[PDB]
Amino acid sequence: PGIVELPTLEDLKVQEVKVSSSVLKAAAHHYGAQCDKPNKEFMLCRWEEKDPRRCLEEGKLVNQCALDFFRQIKRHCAEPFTEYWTCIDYSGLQLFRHCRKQQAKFDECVLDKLGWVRPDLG
Amino acid sequence: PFFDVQKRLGLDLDRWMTIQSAEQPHKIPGRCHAFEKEWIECAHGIGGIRAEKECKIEFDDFVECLLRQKTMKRLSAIKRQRDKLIKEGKYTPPPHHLGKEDPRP
Amino acid sequence: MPLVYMNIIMAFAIALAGLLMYRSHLMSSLLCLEGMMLSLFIMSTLIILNTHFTLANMMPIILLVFAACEAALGLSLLVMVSNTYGTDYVQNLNLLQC
Amino acid sequence: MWFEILPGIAVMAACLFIPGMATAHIHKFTNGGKEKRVAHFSYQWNLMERDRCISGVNRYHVTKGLENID
Amino acid sequence: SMMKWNRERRRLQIEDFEARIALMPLFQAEKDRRVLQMLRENLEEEAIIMKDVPDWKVGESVFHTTRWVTPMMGELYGLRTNEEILSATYGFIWYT
Amino acid sequence: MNPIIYTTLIMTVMSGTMLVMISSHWLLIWIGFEMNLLAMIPVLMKNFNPRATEAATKYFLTQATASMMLMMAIIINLLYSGQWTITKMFNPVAMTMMTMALAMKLGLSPFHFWVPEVTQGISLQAGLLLLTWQKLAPLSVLCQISQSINPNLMLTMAMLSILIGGWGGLNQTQLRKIMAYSSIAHMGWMTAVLPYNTTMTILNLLIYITMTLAMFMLLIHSSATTTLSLSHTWNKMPVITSLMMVTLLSMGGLPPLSGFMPKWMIIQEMTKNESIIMPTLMAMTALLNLYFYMRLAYSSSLTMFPSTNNMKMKWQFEHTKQMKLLPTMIVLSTLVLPMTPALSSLN
Amino acid sequence: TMYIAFILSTIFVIGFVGFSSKPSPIYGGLGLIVSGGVGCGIVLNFGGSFLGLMVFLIYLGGMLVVFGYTTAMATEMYPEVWVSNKTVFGAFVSGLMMEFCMVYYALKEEEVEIIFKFNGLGDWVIYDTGDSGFFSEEAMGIAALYSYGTWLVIVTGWSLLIGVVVIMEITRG
Amino acid sequence: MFMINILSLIIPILLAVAFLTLVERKVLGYMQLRKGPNVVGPYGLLQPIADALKLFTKEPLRPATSSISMFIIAPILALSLALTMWVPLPMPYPLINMNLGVLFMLAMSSLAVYSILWSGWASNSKYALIGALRAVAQTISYEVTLAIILLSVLLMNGSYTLSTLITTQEHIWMIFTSWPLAMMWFISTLAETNRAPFDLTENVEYAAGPFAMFFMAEYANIIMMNAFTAILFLGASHDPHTPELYTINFVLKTLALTITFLWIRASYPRFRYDQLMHLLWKSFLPLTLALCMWHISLPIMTASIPPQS
Amino acid sequence: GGAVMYPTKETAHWKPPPWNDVDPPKDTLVSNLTLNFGPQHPAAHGVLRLVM
Amino acid sequence: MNIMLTLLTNVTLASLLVLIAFWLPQLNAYSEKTSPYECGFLPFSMKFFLVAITFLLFDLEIALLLPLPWASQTNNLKTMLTMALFLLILLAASLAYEWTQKGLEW
Amino acid sequence: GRIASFLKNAWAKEPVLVASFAIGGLAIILPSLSPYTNYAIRINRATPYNYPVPLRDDGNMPDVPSHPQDPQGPSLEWLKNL
Structure with missing residues (x-):
């Protein structure tokens, strides 16, 4: 039947968040709290349009907002964050429990400088 | 003699597993959930005789999702033409298809 | 269908052919019958996995259980027959005719 | 005695x-x-496959931090 | 003791799942962009490969419906290198 | 076998059939068939005999092969359709395989061979159960899939069943084997109209069940398994053999007995579908069934064979067992032709 | 190793020919153990870890071990291999030849059709691109038997219990 | 490097079995007021080497095997399965990490049973088959109870992953939670390996090398089963930075359990087949079923359902 | 009376089924094993033969 | 590939040892024991098979009991608990039947 | 009375079975008579295996939390206390 409509490569090129999984997991809780609105909007789009070719722009905003989130960390809490993710990186399962001391350090600075409050359980 | 005691007593004993579009544990979607949903919704109460012809398109697409026979045929044709071109030296697989260019995250 | 599905279905066909064409021992026929059950298990498992029929991943297990039950039955019949005759030869089952 | 087994x-x-x-x-x-x-x-x-791409040497062990961004 | 320990483990599991949920939208965005990129590359190279082929509508949907259909492994990594295909198919299963 | 255990096994057979007739999922239907087989083998071997063991083994082998083919067909239909409901099968090859399996379970020729042997091996009670209750589940499955049933294959199997049943019955002398071959022929009659009208199959099935119940119960009451052993019955209880004569004539289908109803309605439905050669051949071949029924009636009651001296002692004693259903079954299997318009109730 | 699944399926067919040739029971039982192990490998390759270990633990571990138990206690046979007397040897060779013909008609000719349509493309294509997250689809669905499939549990359990009863009644003499 | 890991798992286990022979000899002797091998090498350290060299030089006699083919496969299967069962075991990090490692172990033990059947059947010896079938019967009963106990104890683990057992027993050893199951499990392990009192003294047709390999496979299975018991019940502390601590503690636990295996061997008279099965069918099995009920109900009634992941 | 109503030459020799569904016991070979307690056996102490 | 490698290495190592134990040690010449396997000629007791069929059925029921650890994560805890207890009760009932009746003769 | 003697006799002769019946019986009665069973259900539901798909705000959903972490929405404080 019809020709599959596919977006051009140019319109799907976005600056990628080139961090490791351990780095993402260390800042995962804060990332969700800070970037909640853009992430939730994109999820709603993909869960209503049900087509990746309709929510490409929303995906871009998520990446851009994610980059801004890490940009603030670098300019305010660079050293404590490095300690946190490095500890998580070592653990094969990337367990949070093994790095609770480092987490407290990163949470404390981020609470003081950036004012971010880590989301609680559930 | 399908004594539909299930519907008479309003008890589900095996209807949960009849289709893959039914509720699955932890809301894990089926591979062809959308196609099966479309086919079932099309052929609801219109009768098997009418469903066989009227909802033919839905079932055809559903079967294509289930077995991917036509998709496999198309991909095989593409592969055959590509290999023929390679043998004649009329095609060069691009570096990203060769893996030279790093993938996107 | 993928070639793997073809091979499994062909395996079922071969086992059925062996079962229907007895040679001497009834034990060999039972082996062919159980092989067919194995082939059906593999076929159903692959189909369910590929379709992501999550709620139907329990079908192969139920098939396996009932398969081994009917086998327990076959073996019990085989030993009764062997104890009566002395061997499990299919030719021994000849009292009933037509 | 018994320590001979040790x-x-x-x-x-x-x-x-x-x-x-x-x-x-x-x-x-x-x-x-x-x-x-x-x-x-x-x-x-x-996560591992993403990490492998992020590294750039096709190895998941090497992990890129904030220095890689921007 | 096992009751208390298991309850704490459940709390930690919920925390880990929340971290996964927080990171999921970014991964979904990357996944959709990557899939579409691979599909486009395959489309362009398909045009180049089978342009000579008579009566070949490049990138013609095999389904009648215009609904988005999640691509199969062949539709994404069909013309990729064998090592990449092996990774995308059996990497997780064979990784032990 | 302990009576409680026997009752549990009988209920298990019934529950398997009920599951087959109650389920909407193919897997559950196959499960019901497996339960039927599992609970049927011990019932067949209630009276431990080498012949009983041979019959059980043959029955198990045939039913196991049938179940294997049935599950294979179900899996193929799942592969090509992703459906588990017992509806129109969406793969022709699966349809053919399932038809073969269900016919083997029923005993339709050319899968008839096991039926006479197993029937002869097992007891009269087990024979009754095998030839009446075990016919319900496969017929139910066939009725549910009648739309998808290939008319050509089913008609061929049914016609061959009628022919082979008649021929085999002509040569038999053992009462159980005669009953088994007649059962094959009647199953052919039942399945002939399956592609056309299922309600007629239900009607024929009910009449066949009543007739076979009456015949088997009369045989049990007379405790006879051969033509001569039944011939001796006239000296002791003439009533039983005369009622047997009536039931045999009904099984032949001679009007105005009940046996005419199923054949009459079947011919009606087949002629409505513009099929004239097939029903004509069916009746002309059922004449053979009538022939062996008439031979049995001759030996039993229409004529009197010599008896033995020991019969005098048996004259003094009276049968203690009382089969409550037998009178009603005899009446329903002989005088019900004035009640055909009740066919609508089946619909 | 892109066609590993196809190789396994061919070996599965070969083992099925081996035990379907009806050889000496001991040799056949092996023809089935080998095929069973291969089939488990195929299921694992598709990702059914639990089901793969199911056949290994139950079918191969118990069902075929009790089968071997019987062959050992009731031993009234002259041992022979699959490549023994022509009755078994010819059958094995012919089955292998039929399988090889199917394979050649399947690989050299992409659209092979004997009774069903088959495509010569590697089975890796049929695999679907998807993520289950922190899930084991197979395990979750099978565990749902206790939650969703209560009726299946009831029927299967009753069948098992009545099976024990039936086995005793049959093997009481 | 992965092949190096495989070799560093296989070779040390075989050497450990070889020295376990000497350890058993000496332990039994000193429990009998005797000195185990003490002449062949210092403290008998060269005794296993002497035994191996003598065996691989003794004239191998042929046992008229009905099927050399099968008679040769049985040793291969036993040894290969024994070696494979060590792979999933977490010494803190397992060689091959399986989400269902426990079921893999159970399946491997189940296949091992075939070695017994194949050996006796191919031996062409009435007494051999009888004894083999007795072994089949013994291993038959152990598998049921072993599986039930393993399932029940893993109901608090949260999965069949072997590595998770370390985390579950991080604070308290599992034995303190399931000690009756531990007792039945240890006795079932004794039954599995036919270690006394579940021996059937009086595959003997195997000569020298073949016998030696069967002996090695059996003793490797002994060590592996004791290791499994250790991981299941006697949890060990694991520091992610320094795994050597867990390795040492685990090795010590396994050694203690093997020493208990020998200690039981020279403490109790051998059972009788009827008694062994009237244990593994009429004493253990009902208790295992009841304890399985308890270990299903307990996590739900105490809100202690372990994490799935 | 007979196996079949119209018998053939081969079927003529064939015997009608027994009156009771009980086919006669065939051979009735004893399965009682005759084991020998070989002297080498430990319990025999090397000098004991127990035909059992 | 790792697990396949482990299986291959183990099997090959065992087979190599079997080679060096079946064919290498028999190379050494040890005269010839001109000793024939003097054979001059069946305990198919149910006592063994019964142990086997019952094991098969109990193993089948054990197979149904395997998915229990993952089944504890279901929200319908009451229903799952009831079904698990039902399966265990049926196992116990099967054992009781055999014990009460003429079974467990082993 | 008579039952009490039977239990004593049973434990004297077949203690293993008596224990098995008791443990099995408690493993059935105790679950229903336990308050933590309700909690065990809640914990299983609480565990967020899959993503909480957001819903489009229509302006008439006061209870539904349109924010990262504010009072609206479910609370896991009960588990934290446990």
Whole structure:
């Protein structure tokens, strides 16, 4: 039947968040709290349009907002964050429990400088 | 003699597993959930005789999702033409298809 | 269908052919019958996995259980027959005719 | 007396100790001096595959931090 | 003791799942962009390969419906290198 | 066998059939068939005999092969359709395989061979159960899939069943084997109209069940398994053999007995579908069934064979067992032709 | 190793020919153990870890071990291999030849059709691109038997219990 | 490097079995007021080497095997399965990490049973088959109870992953939670390996090398089963930075359990087949079923359902 | 009376089924094993033969 | 590939040892024991098979009991608990039947 | 009375079975008579295996939390206390 409509490569090129999984997991809780609105909007789009070719722009905003989130960390809490993710990186399962001391350090600075409050359980 | 005691007593004993579009544990979607949903919704109460012809398109697409026979045929044709071109030296697989260019995250 | 599905279905066909064409021992026929059950298990498992029929991943297990039950039955019949005759030869089952 | 058995038990103990130590050391040596990551579920493997792409050397052990961004 | 320990483990599991949920939208965005990129590359190279082929509508949907259909492994990594295909198919299963 | 255990096994057979007739999922239907087989083998071997063991083994082998083919067909239909409901099968090859399996379970020729042997091996009670209750589940499955049933294959199997049943019955002398071959022929009659009208199959099935119940119960009451052993019955209880004569004539289908109803309605439905050659051949071949029924009636009651001296002692004693259903079954299997318009109730 | 699944399926067919040739029971039982192990490998390759270990633990571990138990206690046979007397040897060779013809008609000719349509493309294509997250689809669905499939549990359990009863009644003499 | 890991798992286990022979000899002797091998090498350290060299030089006699083919496969299967069962075991990090390692172990033990059947059947010896079938019967009963106990104890682990057992027993050893199951499990392990009192003294047709390999496989299975018991019940502390601590503690636990295996061997008279099965069918099995009920109900009634992941 | 109503030459020799569904016991070979307690056996102390 | 490698290495190692134990040690010449396997000629007791069929059925029921650890994560805890207890009760009932009736003769 | 003697006789002769019946019986009665069973259900539901798909705000959903972490929405404080 019809020709599959596919977006051009140019319109799907976005600056990628080139961090490791351990780095993402260390800042995962804060990332969700800070970037909640853009992430939730994109999820709603993909869960209503049900087509990746309709929510490409929303995906871009998520990446851009994610980059801004890490940009603030670098300019305010660079050293404590490095300690946190490095500890998580070592653990094969990337367990949070093994790095609770480092987490407290990163949470404390981020609470003081950036004012971010880590989301609680559930 | 399908004594539909299930519907008479309003008890589900095996209807949960009849289709893959039914509720699955932890809301894990089926591979062809959308196609099966479309086919079932099309052929609801219109009768098997009418469903066989009227909802033919839905079932055809559903079967294509289930077995991917036509998709496999198309991909095989593409592969055959590509290999023929390679043998004649009329095609060069691009570096990203060769893996030279790093993938996107 | 993928070639793997073809091979499994062909395996079922071969086992059925062996079962229907007895040679001497009834034990060999039972082996062919159980092989067919194995082939059906593999076929159903692959189909369910590929379709992501999550709620139907329990079908192969139920098939396996009932398969081994009917086998327990076959073996019990085989030993009764062997104890009566002395061997499990299919030719021994000849009292009933037509 | 009874302590004469201890030599043989010690030799067997060293023999049994070799495997676990070898496994741990080889894991760390081949996984960038870190505990070998586990993939019990697809999400964990997806993180590994993403990490492999992020590294740029097709190795998941090397991890890129904030220095890689911007 | 096992009751208390298991309850704490459940709390930690919920925390880990929340971290996964927080990171999921970014991964979904990357996944969709990557899939579409691979599909486009395959489309362009398909045009180049089978342009000579008579009566070949490049990138013609095999389904009648215009609904988005999640691509199969062949539709994404069909013309990729064998090592990449092996990874995308059996990497997780063979990784032990 | 302990009576409680026997009751549990009988209920298990019934529950398997009920599951087959109650389920909407193919897997559950196959499960019901497996339960039927599992609970049927011990019932067949209630009276431990080498012949009983041979019959059980043959029955198990045939039913196991049938179940294997049935599950294979179900799996193929799942592969090509992703459906588990017992509806129109969406793969022709699966349809053919399932038809073969269900016919083997029924005993339709050319899968008839096991039926006479197993029937002869097992007891009269087990024979009754095998030839009446075990016919319900496969017929139910066939009725549910009648739309998808290939008319050509089913008609061929049914016609061959009628022919082979008649021929085999002509040569038999053992009462159980005669009953088995007649059962094959009647199953052919039942399945002939399956592609056309299922309600007629239900009607024929009910009449066949009543007739076979009456015949088997009369045989049990007379405790006879051969033509001569039944011939001796006239000296002791003439009523039983005369009622047997009536039931045999009904089984032949001679009007105005009940046996005419199923044949009459079947011919009606087949002629409505523009099929004239097939029903004509069916009746002309059922004449053979009538022939062996008439031979049995001759030996039993229409004529009197010599008896033995020991019969005098048996004259003094009276049968203690009382089969409550037998009178009603005899009446319903002989005088019900004035009640055909009740066919609508089946619909 | 892109066609590993196809190789396994061919070996599965070969083992099925081996035990379907009805050889000496001991040799056949092996023809089935080998095929069973291969089939488990195929299921694992598709990702059914639990089901793969199911056949290994139950079918191969118990069902075929009790089968071997019987062959050992009731041993009234002259041992022979699959490549023994022509009755078994010819059958094995012919089955292998039929399988090889199917394979050649399947690989050299992409659209092979004997009774069903088959495509010569590697089975890796049929695999679907998807993520289950922190899930084991197979395990979750099978565990749902206790939650969703209560009716299946009831029927299967009753069948098992009545099976024990039936086995005793049959093997009481 | 992975092949190096495989070799560093296989070779040390075989050497450990070889020295376990000497350890058993000496332990039994000193429990009998005797000195085990003490002449062949210092403290008998060269005794296993002497035994191996003598065996691989003794004239191998042929046992008229009905099927050399099968008679040769049985040793291969036993040894290969024994070696494979060590792979999933977490010494803190396992060689091959399986989400269902426990079921893999159970399946491997189940296949091992075939070695017994194949050996006796191919031996062409009435007494051999009888004894083999007795072994089949013994291993038959152990598998049921072993599986039930393993399932029940893993109901608090949260999965079949072997590595998770370390985390579950991080604070308290599992035995303190399931000690009756531990007792039945240990006795079932004794039954599995036919270690006394579940021996059937009086595959003997195997000569020298073949016998030696069967002996090695059996003793490797002994060590592996004791290791499994250790991981299941006697949890060990694991520091992610220094795994050697866990390795040492685990090895010590396994050695203690093997020493208990020998200690039982020279403490109790051998059972009788009827008694062994009237244990593994009429004493253990009902208790295992009841305890399985308890270990299903307990996590739910105490809100202690372990994490799935 | 007979196996079949119209018998053939081969079927003529064939015997009608027994009156009771009980086919006669065939051979009735004893399965009682005759084991020998070989002297080498430990319990025999090397000098004991127990035909059992 | 790792697990396949482990299986291959183990099997090959075992087979190599079997080679060096079946064919290498028999190379050494040890005269010839001209000793024939003097054979001059069946305990198919149910006592063995019964142990086997009952094991098969109990193993089948054990197979149904395997998915229990993952089944504890279901929200419908009451229903799952009831079904698990039902399966265990049926196992106990099967054992009781055999014990009460003429079974467990082993 | 008579039952009490039977239990004593049973434990004297077949203690293993008596224990098995008791443990099995408690493993059935105790679950229903336990308050933590309700909690065990809640914990299983609480565990967020899959993503909480957001819903489009229509302006008439006060209870539904349109924010990262504010009072609206479910609370896991009960588990934290446990």
